[PDB]
Amino acid sequence: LNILKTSNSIKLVNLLSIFISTWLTAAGFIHLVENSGDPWENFQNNQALTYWECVYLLMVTMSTVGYGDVYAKTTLGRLFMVFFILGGLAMFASYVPEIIELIGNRKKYGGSYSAVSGR
Amino acid sequence: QRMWWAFLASSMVTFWQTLTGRVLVVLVFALSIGALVIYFIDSSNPIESCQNFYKDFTLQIDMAFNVFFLLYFGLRFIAANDKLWFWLEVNSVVDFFTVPPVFVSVYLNRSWLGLRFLRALRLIQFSEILQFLNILKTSNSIKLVNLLSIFISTWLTAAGFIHLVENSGDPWENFQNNQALTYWECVYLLMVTMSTVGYGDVYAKTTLGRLFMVFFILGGLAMFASYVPEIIELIGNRKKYGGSYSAVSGRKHIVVCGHITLESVSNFLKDFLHKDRDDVNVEIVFLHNISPNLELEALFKRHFTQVEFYQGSVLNPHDLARVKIESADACLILANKYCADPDAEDASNIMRVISIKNYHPKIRIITQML
Numbered sequence A: 001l002n003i004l005k006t007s008n009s010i011k012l013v014n015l016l017s018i019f020i021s022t023w024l025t026a027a028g029f030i031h032l033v034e035n036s037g038d039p040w041e042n043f044q045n046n047q048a049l050t051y052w053e054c055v056y057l058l059m060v061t062m063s064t065v066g067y068g069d070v071y072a073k074t075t076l077g078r079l080f081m082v083f084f085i086l087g088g089l090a091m092f093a094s095y096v097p098e099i100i101e102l103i104g105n106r107k108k109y110g111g112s113y114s115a116v117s118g119r
Numbered sequence B: 001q002r003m004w005w006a007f008l009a010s011s012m013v014t015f016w017q018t019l020t021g022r023v024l025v026v027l028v029f030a031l032s033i034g035a036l037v038i039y040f041i042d043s044s045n046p047i048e049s050c051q052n053f054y055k056d057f058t059l060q061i062d063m064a065f066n067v068f069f070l071l072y073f074g075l076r077f078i079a080a081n082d083k084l085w086f087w088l089e090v091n092s093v094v095d096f097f098t099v100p101p102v103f104v105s106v107y108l109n110r111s112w113l114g115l116r117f118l119r120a121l122r123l124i125q126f127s128e129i130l131q132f133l134n135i136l137k138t139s140n141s142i143k144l145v146n147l148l149s150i151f152i153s154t155w156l157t158a159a160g161f162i163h164l165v166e167n168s169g170d171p172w173e174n175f176q177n178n179q180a181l182t183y184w185e186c187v188y189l190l191m192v193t194m195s196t197v198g199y200g201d202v203y204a205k206t207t208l209g210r211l212f213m214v215f216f217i218l219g220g221l222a223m224f225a226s227y228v229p230e231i232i233e234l235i236g237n238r239k240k241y242g243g244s245y246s247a248v249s250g251r252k253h254i255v256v257c258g259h260i261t262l263e264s265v266s267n268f269l270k271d272f273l274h275k276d277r278d279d280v281n282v283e284i285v286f287l288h289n290i291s292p293n294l295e296l297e298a299l300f301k302r303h304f305t306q307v308e309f310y311q312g313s314v315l316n317p318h319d320l321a322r323v324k325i326e327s328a329d330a331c332l333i334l335a336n337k338y339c340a341d342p343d344a345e346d347a348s349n350i351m352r353v354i355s356i357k358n359y360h361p362k363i364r365i366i367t368q369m370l
Helices: A008-036 A051-061 A075-094 A097-103 B007-011 B019-044 B057-078 B083-088 B090-108 B117-124 B126-132 B140-168 B183-194 B207-230 B262-272 B294-302 B317-323 B342-359
Strands: B253-258 B283-288 B307-311 B330-334 B364-367
Touching: A008 A051, A008 A075, A008 A097, A051 A075, A051 B207, A075 A097, A097 B207, B007 B090, B019 B057, B019 B117, B019 B126, B019 B140, B019 B183, B057 B090, B083 B090, B090 B117, B117 B126, B117 B140, B126 B140, B140 B183, B140 B207, B183 B207, B253 B342, B262 B283, B262 B294, B283 B317, B294 B307, B307 B317, B317 B342, B330 B342, B342 B364
Parallel strands: B253 B283, B253 B330, B283 B307, B330 B364
Antiparallel strands: none
């Protein structure tokens, strides 16, 4: 649908669509698994979670910040934390970002000359 | 109460190089420094407080700063030229969002600390003028100063914003859930975020604060990983041997120049500083363009009290004046003996000899020759 084709579109495709999709599906995944509770323990530890703090928990879990404010309170939740770390940290370390660092800045002198009349 | 249609309207969200410019920009960041200092001073005070026109004596200096910022605002009108890019300018936007809100707060005769610290962007201005003030006339050093200036600028701005969101609270929850911590505490937390250590002893209680700092720490890690690779090496690529030679009265010295290499200088030192000599009391100095190798600094360190090194060329009379060959007893020239064309080294040594004799025609020269 007539996007701005200056490699910005392709960098959008290969970075931010997949980043947002994975982040949002992981947030919804932890929300479901935490609100479900423990199956064999009759769902006694079903922690009440909102989506804002869920996605905040994802972003705290990735990168390196080890905030003790929020964490997984159940065994399968901690399982899924481990899998999410093993996937997302490896991705954010060696697959996605190098593209955005090799994007760099835009062109320095790509403009034209304005013919000012009288000179 | 809690009015915003006047502060935002003041923020204006809609939209009769020379010394003349130098004086005004110096005044601009000097008053920015003063206002940021007094903001840090009264940061412990609550955001909202009453203030009469003749009550706060400290705020009178703030009003002098405010009318001077209004003068700079009129200067911005004068230098606007193109109005579209004038309101597109980021510094102009910051001034729009900080000075008219101060005017409205003073008209209302009440204190409001919201977005008052935004002048920290102007703290990067003195880096350019430090070159004018001939403290640092180089390029790498002024680039490092500018980079640390923008680092500390985004530091103080982010610390202030996190502090205000922290002590404000949720507006839809009657802002009664706000935590209580000081500017030093928010500084500590923002180290906690930027450093990615993540202590978690004290966090951002506000939900909107968390939803801000999430993409803020994304941007911060991006800019950190972008900028440190051109920060770390600056301490490495700095000239060390650019100084001159300090003569010692009553003790002579000689000058060794030409092609100097590890094995050549090793042999020369080993047969010149031999222990079986009656008395050696001459300093040995070196002149060359290519920086010495780590083994050569190792030799210089193990002979720290006998040999000194300097970087320069024998064809530069300024370099010869720096080495001070007037008091030198003699000059030595080492010639490469392994290159393809022998006549090239002969001609090079001839140029060295004529330059040295032209600078001083009454010294002793001993040279190799192929």
